[PDB]
Every structure is written in C-alpha cells, then in structure tokens.
C-alpha cells in the first residue's frame, strides 16, 4: 500500500534502517493481514482398539 | 543501577578476584547469615555488595578476619 512518507531523522527513532510509523496507520487498519493456520487431528486404528 | 565498577577495580587491580570477593559477600548476604553495612536503596544483593566494596568496608582480608572471628 502507498503511504505518505517524509525523509528526515526523528529523534533517532528511525536511527538505522528502522522505520517510524504513525498511529493513523494502525487506526486506518491498513497494515493488518489475515493469516490462517491449519491443524489436523488424526484418529487411526491401533491394535489395542 | 550501578553503571560502573571502576572504583571497585581500582581497589583491587586484578579486576577478576574482585568478582570473587563480591560474590562471596553477596552470597553471605542473600542466604541471610549476615547483614549489609550500607543503607540499601531497593537494590538487589549483587549491587549492594559492589556498593559496599567501592566504599572500602569489605575486601578479602576483612572477610577472612570476620569469618575466623
């Protein structure tokens, strides 16, 4: 997604390649992804039953 | 937090047996056989023992004399 960036050092919170982000980004819910795990339970036939 | 131990190493210049004497003292302090000679400021017993070492009250010889006494 395309967002408004400003190139400047902001009290070394973007010191190294790190990135600073605005609470509006989480508010607007624009970097929230959906993930999906699969789980499997298998019932086999043992000789005890 | 005690950010530098430079004065404690200036007391004993080896900088290694410093750790041993401070460990013995802090172990006598944790298992409550002894009492601290310095007013604690909510420090744990390690930094207490270092604070005591830097003030000149405790070294190896004081430990030996007090133990035999």
């Amino acid at each position: 997604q395309n967002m408004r960036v400003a190139f400047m050092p902001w009290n070394g919170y973007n010191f190294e390649d790190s990135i600073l982000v605005s609470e509006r980004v989480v508010q607007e819910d624009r970097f929230t992804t959906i993930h999906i795990q699969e789980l499997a339970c298998v019932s086999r036939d043992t000789k005890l039953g | 937090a005690r950010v530098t131990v430079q004065d404690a190493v200036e007391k004993i210049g080896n900088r290694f047996d410093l750790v041993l004497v401070a460990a013995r003292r802090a172990r006598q302090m944790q298992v409550g056989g002894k009492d601290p000679l310095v007013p604690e400021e909510n420090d744990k017993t390690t930094v207490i023992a270092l604070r005591e070492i830097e003030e000149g009250l405790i070294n190896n010889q004081i430990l030996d004399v007090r133990e035999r006494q």
């Binding site: - | 210049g13 290694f16 390690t46």
Partner: protein
Amino acid sequence: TEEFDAIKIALASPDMIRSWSFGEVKKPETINYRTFKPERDGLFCARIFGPVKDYECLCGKYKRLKHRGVICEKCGVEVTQTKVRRERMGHIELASPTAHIWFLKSLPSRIGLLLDMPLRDIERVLYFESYVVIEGGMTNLERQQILTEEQYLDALEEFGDEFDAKMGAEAIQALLKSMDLEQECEQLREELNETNSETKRKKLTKRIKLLEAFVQSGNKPEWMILTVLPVLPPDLRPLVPLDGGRFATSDLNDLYRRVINRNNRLKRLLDLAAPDIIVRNEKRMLQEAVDALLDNGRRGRAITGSNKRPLKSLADMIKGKQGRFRQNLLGKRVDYSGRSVITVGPYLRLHQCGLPKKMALELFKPFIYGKLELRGLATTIKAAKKMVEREEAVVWDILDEVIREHPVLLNRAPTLHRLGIQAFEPVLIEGKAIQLHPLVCAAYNADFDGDQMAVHVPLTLEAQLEARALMMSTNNILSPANGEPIIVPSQDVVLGLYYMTRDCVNAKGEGMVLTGPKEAERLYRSGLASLHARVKVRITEYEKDANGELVAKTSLKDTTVGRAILWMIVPKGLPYSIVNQALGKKAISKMLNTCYRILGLKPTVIFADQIMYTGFAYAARSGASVGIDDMVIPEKKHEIISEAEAEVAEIQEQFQSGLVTAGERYNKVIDIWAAANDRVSKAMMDNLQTETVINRDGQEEKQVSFNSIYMMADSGARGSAAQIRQLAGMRGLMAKPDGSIIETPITANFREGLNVLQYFISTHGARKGLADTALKTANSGYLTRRLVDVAQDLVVTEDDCGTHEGIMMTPVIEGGDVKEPLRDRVLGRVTAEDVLKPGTADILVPRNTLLHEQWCDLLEENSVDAVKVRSVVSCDTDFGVCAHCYGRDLARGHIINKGEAIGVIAAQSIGEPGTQLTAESSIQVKNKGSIKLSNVKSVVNSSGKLVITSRNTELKLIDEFGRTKESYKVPYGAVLAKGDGEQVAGGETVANWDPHTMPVITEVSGFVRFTDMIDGQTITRQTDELTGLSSLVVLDSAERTAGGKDLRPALKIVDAQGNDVLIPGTDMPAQYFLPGKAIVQLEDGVQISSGDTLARIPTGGLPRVADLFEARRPKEPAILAEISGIVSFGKETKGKRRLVITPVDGSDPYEEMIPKWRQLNVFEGERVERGDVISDGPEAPHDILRLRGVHAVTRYIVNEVQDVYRLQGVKINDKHIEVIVRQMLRKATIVNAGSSDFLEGEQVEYSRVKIANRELEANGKVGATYSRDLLGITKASLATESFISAASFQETTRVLTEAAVAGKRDELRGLKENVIVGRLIPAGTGYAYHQDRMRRRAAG
C-alpha cells in the same frame, strides 16, 4: 559428582569390553511394533540394559520401589530407575575376529606400519582375494609373500605341513599376538645406530616411536582386532515410536541390526561347516557391516533404505560440525534464553536495554516464583505458577522488583569478537522487539533492518557479578583489538552534531555577545537566534593541570550558537577547543578519546550518552532530507563528456590507420577516460561543495555549502566521496568478468537515468561484489575458528618472568613515508632495557616500565627512533605468559591482570575484522633531508659514481633532528648521483636504473679477455658491418645448443697489459662466467665505459593472511645461505647443478642442488651473509626462522600481516599477531642428546623445564641444545599436548587414534578442555579457583 581430573584414553581390551557390558544382544529385533514392550532379547532389552519404566519389571510381577535389587524370575529385568538404561552398555560376541577400521584406514595406517606391511597388501587380504603365508616354517617361502589362488592350491597340495597361511582380520590378529615388541624395538634401535639415510631414517624413527609408545602405555597390539563389540546404551540410540504405529530410528539401529544379522548367519554357517568360499563371503559381509558401524564412509558407503544418502555412523556422530564436540559440547543450548528483533530505543542509558514484558516474565519465571513465595502472595509453587499464567498486577510488580539490578546478556547472531556478547540492565517495555542502545550497535555490527538478538539470563550470584562487571556495555568502551573507542557515534548522532557546530556567514543574531551557553539555548529555542550563527560567548572551561584539581579559566571565544549548545554536556576537564571545530565523525571520535584519557570511565560513559541524546535531538530539529535537487549535476559535465568523446574518436580513427597497437590504444582510451572522470568529479565537487553564495550586509561571500547530501558526505555519517561521485558525476570505470576494464564508461548517474548497457554492467559489478562477500564470510569464519582454537590455552599466569630478551621495534617506513608511527607501535609495551638519550648515561626509561601516553610524548620530545620492547614470543614463562612480556592493551587501560586469556582475545581481534579484505625508475625524496646509506660498502670509480657493491643496500633519510623519515632499498647496479652528506631538494632524482634490465657491473678496467669462448662449438659468430652490430649469443644452461652443452664460455677481466686485475684485498682470479642470454652486442674494439650493459633480463587479502598464519610454502620458495664464505661450483651437469658453500672458517661439506631454471642473483666470488637471498621469490617462514632465528621470523610475519590489514585501514595491535606466532612455534626438535630420545618433536616448554631442572640441581648433569620449529596453526593445533583440544575440531578419527595408541593422559590444563568437561576455565574469574585446586593436591 566426583572431583576428578586426568581423562585417560587407551585401547579397550576385550575383557574390559566384557566388563562394561551387562548382556549379550543375540537377535537384531528390538520391539514387537504391535505391543511396544521391548524384545526379550534384542537391541532394546530390559533384562540387559534396564527397565523401561522406573522401578518396575517387564512382566509386572514386581513394580514397587521396596524392591531395588530383585530380578524378576519370569522376566530377567531388574527393578531400578529407568535412567540407568542410559548408561548400561551391551556387547556382541563376534565369531570371526574383526579389524577396527579406525586403526587401519587412518592416513598413517598404524596396523600397517606396526606390522611393517604396506597398506595395499592389507587391503588385498581384507577383501578376501588372496592369502598370505605368516611364518611358514621350514619351507622355501618368505613371511610376507602374497599368494594367488591356484598358487596357494599347488603349494598346499605339494606342502601339506610346514605351510601356515590363514585369512582375514583373524590372520592379522595372529600376526599381532606373535610379535615380540621389545626384541624388534631393540633391533630397530641398532638399525638406527647403523643406518644414515634421510627417508629410511624417518620411517624408522616413526616406527620406533610407535613401538616405544606401546611398550610404555601397556596396550597390547592384538587389541586393534575386535573380538567383542560393545553396543551403545539404548536411550543414546533411540527407537522412538512415531504417533501412528510407525517408528523413527537412528541409523545406528539399522547398522547394529545388519551386524547382528550377518553375525548370526555366520554363526549358523560355522556350525554347518560350509565350504571356505561361503564363509569367506560371510566374513567379508560382516566386515562391511562392522566397519560401517564404526566409521561408515571408508568403503562402498553402505547407504540407507530408499534414501540415497549415506547413513551416519558413530565416527560421523563424533567427528564433524553437525555431529558432536562442535555441536553439543562447545555449542550447547542454554535455558532462560530468548530471541527477538532489535529496535532503536534512543532514550536508553548506555548500560541498559529495552526488554519486552512477556519474554522477561518467561525468562525470570523461577525468580518470580521465589519472590512470590517469599512475599507470601502464593502458598506453594503451583499456586505461583497459576498466578504467573493469569498474569495479575502483582506478578508485574514482582517482576519489576526482581528485574531491578539483574543484568541480562545480549548477543547478536555472528559473535565475531567479545563485544558480540554484552550485559545490560533491562527495562520492561511493551512490544515484542528487543530494544538495543544505539551507541553499542557498532560493537554488535547491529542494524535495524530485521537483525535479531538473543537474550540470556545469568542465574547464580557469581554469574550476575561477572555479567555486570566484565561484560556490561559501559565497561567495554575500548576495543580489545586496538585501544581506540568502539562506541563512537555512528550516523544520526554525528549528523546532528555536525549540523550543530558548522557555522554560516550570515544568519539571525550575527555577532551578538552571549554570557554563556545557557542564554545561547535561550536564544535558539525561542527562535531569536539561528542554531548556527557566529557569535562571541564568554565561557568558563575547567582544566586539571594541578595534581587532580580543576582550575576554571574564563574568557571570550568566537564560536557558533551550536558549539555553545553542545558545550553544555562536556565534562569539566576538557578543553573548549575540542568542540570549536566542524565536529565530524573523526572529530567526535577524538573528542571521546580525549575525554576518556583525561577523566576516566564514568565521565566518558555519561558524556557519550549526552552526545547521543543531543545529536539525535538536533538532527531531528535540523530536518535534513534528500530531494532530487540536492544532488547537483555539474554544469560543465556535458562539455567534458563531449570533449572526451571527440578525443576517443580521434584516437580510434588514428588507430585504424595503424600507428599504434591495440593494447596501446586500449591504454590511451582508459587513461583519457580516467582523466575525464577525475575532471567531472572535481567539477562536481566544486559545484556542490562551496556553492552557497549567500550575502552578508553588503557584498557577497562564499562558504562551505549546506547541501544535505554534502553534509551527509563530509560529516562521515553516511556515504563517501565515491558515492557522492556515483550520485552526481559519471560513475567511473567498470570491470568485466575477467577483470578487464570496459572502454566506454557509464557517463550517466543515478540522478539521471542509465540505459540498458550501463545498468547491465553495474549489475555485473554488484553481483560479483555480493558473491565475494558470501565466500569471504565463509573463509573468514573458518580462519577465525582456527585462530581462536590454536591460542585458547594461552593464559597470563605469572606477573614477571624476568627475562632480558625482547624485540627491537621500529616504525615500518615503507618507501615514501611513515605508514605507521612509533608511538602507536610502542604504546603500552614494557621496555627490555633502559634506553639512553643521544648522550650516554642519560637514562630515559628505567628497567621494564609500561610505556603509557606520557612516556610516548616524552619520547616525542626527544628523538628516539627504535625501542627494544619485551614481546610475548620471547617470554620465558612456562605454560603461559607473564603480565610484563605482554603489556597493557585491553578494553581497559591498565597493565594486563594475571589470569586473563590473552590467546582468545588475540585470535578474536585478528579474526573478526577479517571480513573486508580483498615502473620504479627514479627515487623522489618527499621531504628535504640528509641522505644516509645503511649496510653498504662502496668503491668510487673513475666516472665519479658511488658504485654499489652490496645486494642488501639501503638508502634512508635523516631529518634535521636525527630521524629516519624515508627508506628505500637500492639494488646492485643502480646508477647513483649523490653520495653521503648531500642535502636533497623535494622530489629530486637521487638514483637511476633500467626498469626491465639488470646490468652486470664491472669493478675494474682493462681489456675484455675471451677464455673458453671458442667460436663454432658453443657460439656462432653472426656479426654485422662497421657500425659495430653483432649477435654473439652466450646461451644459458637450458637454451645452450646441443654441441655447446658442456663447454662453458667465460670472460676474464684483464687490464691493458694482460694480467688479470685482482679484486682489491682478495687474491681471487676474476673468472666471470657469462650468465644466461649474454648478448654480446658491443664487439671487440670499443673502449669499455664504466657501466656497459652486459646482460638484459626481462596476492593479498584473506588468502594471504590465512597463508601467513598457516606458514604455507609458496610453491616457489627463494633460497638462502646457511653459512658465509666463498661459494663454489661442483660436479657439473648431473641434471641439477651443484653448489657447495665453502666456509672460510667452518667445515665445507654443505652442498645444495639447484634446478636448471633457477637464475642466481649473487656472483661466485661474492661475500654472502647467512640467510641472504640467493634466488628471488617469496620466502617461506620456516627458513627465516631456522637461519635468522625467532625475532626475525616473528617480525616478518607481524609486518607482512599488518601490511594486509592496514591496506584496508583496519587497526590491530601487533601483540595479537605476536601471540598467535608464539602459539605457532610451540614445538622444537632436539639435536643433541642427554635426557631426550635424540630426535623427538617436543614442545619447547618441556624442553626448557628439563634444562631448568638440570640448572636447579647443584650438579650440572646434562643440558641438551634444541632447535626451534615453526608450525602452521592447523598442524600446530594438531600437535597439541592435550588430545581433547585437537579432537575438538580436526579429523576426530586421526587424533583419537593417535591418543588411543599412545595411551595419552589429559590433565586438561587448558580452556577448551575445561569447557568441554563443564568445569571452571583456568582463565579470569576461575584462575584463582584452579590455582586453589593446584594447592589442594599434595597438601594438607
């Protein structure tokens, strides 16, 4: 746990193996796969190895703990704790005695030479193709005769008796049992007393040493053949049942099953008395299975079921990276540890780190439980657990309270050097990322682009104290490699400070006078003055000039607002000047340096934190950004490019006509393009650098621009001039795959747009770069591993050994100037002896004193040039080094403390930086000085030249006050101009010689006389007309014609009368053997001038460092002289020309063969010195050490490595290279006799202590002279005393076999052994402990 020491290794006898074993595994089955109870007999058996479940038998008759020794009558399983199933070993009774693969296939085949039988024969026997007649009684056949099938048949039929032959490992065991160790040993000593020949004497000495080792150790040779085979406890080779009735098994289960199968089938076949062929096949099959068990991979590589990969055998489990020692015994996996992504956290103190709540709770769980129970919040431990799993406010309060002073260890994945692990005090924070203090990133090489870090918790009290004292960030500000600071501000900080200190011609508040920095800040933050604006301020600096008292000096300085704002932080002791400048990267670094040297640690720490905060803040206030217009295309670029294109066009057209070769045209184009690149770069730098033409009140002025990209360049925050060029200029020349340089460069830049070709080329460049870094990293890692490995055991044990030896250290002045000054080279080294002023009895430094900054400055005030300092290599201490011989240099400033493991610090410091490692016509004096010649003996001739007659001649430069600035090496035959005394102007040509031509120089005058220079036989007169042209060819040994092979043409130098003029002082008849390719152009009849031409004669980085440290013969070594004196020729043309060195005093008989291709640099009648060059090329360190001795080889290695390292601009102190070298030459070879075995390679330590014991005894007794040896770190480590150290990283099989046969005993004595065994290392905090234990033995 017992208190033990001395791990002993030896061959296991079959009775001992039976002793360990608890039962026989008869059938290969393990478990019923249906009911998971183990087999009644099998690889997993309860009656042999132990009960599956604690204290209960298999059939279930006895299950209670009341019974602890009973063995159930039905199931023979004893009732005990299942843990024992982890230690009980079993055994298998082999029907056919089997060979141990390790003792056979290991490169020196110890069965082979022990039996004195070549490996080929043993292999012939083992695969069952032929017999061997072992002690065939009274017949006509020897003892090691190989016999073919039908030869054995006809022999057996003819000779029924007195014919003893057998087959296989049982035959070999028979050979071993019947051997008389001592009789053969004594016979061998007699043979050695009778034999004088190199190679046979070496094989004999190896064998005699093997025999002596067996008779001393008490191992009988027959044990190399296995009769009983032990089987590993089951829980160590599990057969775990996967969910779903299927099983997962280690490969050892498969191998054991196969072995048992083949064994049982062979047993049945033996009971059946099957024919020999079949039993032989079965015995072979059992051999493959067993040898696959022991070491799978030395045969047809018995692969696994349906996977095509060779399965892993025991040797594979031990040896190798993935297997063992590396993986599980030096590379464990601790508890109370975590991992997460790293983040900035500027607000932190230097000694702290942001730690997520949830990880901190998880790590400190048991601490939480303890504190919760102490406070009574929880009745029992389970209630504490439940309280932690709900995570109530009380839990967080307890966590905050416990965390208070508890330090944690932070580590970053590639721990290159010891600063890869540091301790911090954690501060609980939200989030899932670990917060790392910015200043320490440089130490960690950490970057916030997804780098992760691990966090460990020290548990015991001694560990806590050690983490906070030794490892804490604030205690490690100086790099252990060189003394300089590690924590220097990196990029944002330095940018902010740079912005703050730079001044501008005109701004708001120009030239107003401020009473101090505080009102400067008043002005700046209120917007009544610019952050940078020239101003007069009154400032009170403090100076500790007295004995530790601070004196305030208060005056008016002309500075910027910004410099005042910065001054607020600076501690008292520092001069104002420090901040007064532009304050870039270097300036800030040296600021920190001075602050440390003057005040000490704590002020430096707090000052660094302050610097970080102010830099970050004001960088943010600056608002520095990067727009497309910030990078200014030079206005005159297009002209430069069009001009260069016109020039290249003219040169190419002028090529098509054919006045210049292709190579010459290439060179011309490349040079013109390079010049154009430099032109555009300089134009761009002029445009960008000082372009702010801003106006003061009236007229204009110009100043260093405020272009953001330029500030980023100049400050040293990011980018170099090269990248600025790459942005705004033409991006220079490129290299094609093979290294050749493309003719047309990339004229475009990233501000503009490249096109397909230029991009493509740069793509190649970047690709090659990346691949380089990958392979470079792998090689680095390997090199640093060897280094830390070899030098681990070295520890500072003694305070002062008291030796007078030392190395005379000078500043390495390579050619033009002083690449590295004295002061840094000597700082922190103790002196070997007092040095005197230029006037005797004027002692400048008492006997050994640590040379700190004050002494170095004092030496600067005087004019000391070279200082002899005690070095670690020459240290006298046994089993370690002494504090004084080492010196001070550390992350701290003081003399080294007893106990410190200097080997590892040296190895790490040399290894970690190793990841950025990849004409001569006229001499030109750089600075006006006096010329001085060293190690020369000249003879002024008639032409008026100071003729150089020495090959080792040097021309140094003494300055006004007696110091050697420049140094050059002047070879034989270089025309000279100025002699001795003359002052030479700047850049004036003092010497001259032909680059691609080495002339042969005559010493005397007269007529050239032809001796053995016969016409027709070896030379062919093809001569031209009057003008004196000829083609007389004196060919070399290789190129001489077929007829003139043995007739050697010569030129004797006679005078005008005829008599051979003799070299002054010597009687030698001058018989000049014309060397190779002697083109006699100037024919007979032209008066020879002094200087006539007789004969025209036409790697670095990581591999170079690894090769220097491994002491690898560079495949074409130069040759040296052993003794001095008249050399001479000998028996001619045998295939390698003989040179016999004849000593004027010493004995003659030293001959050296020389190949035909070798060219000689010295004349026959010349005066050589020992270890002078005879042939040109790279010298192998071994010869230099052997001839010149220890200090020479150590200086050579140190300088050669330091050259590579400084070429990249990485500073390392020489002491580390010295420590490694000292670890390299640990071994010596005995040449005399008296207490040793007269030839054994023995460490110099044991040899020295033997001499010391003789000295300690009142009687002189025997002292034996020894010669030093230098071994490369891989082999040197292989020949270590302790066998666990060597086994830890090398071929495990080889060293294990050597120690097993030798019966070696390990006292552990080292660091790595103690680590492996899990006791206290003998270094540092544990040194006292081990010293204490030393007192505990042999005491009361």
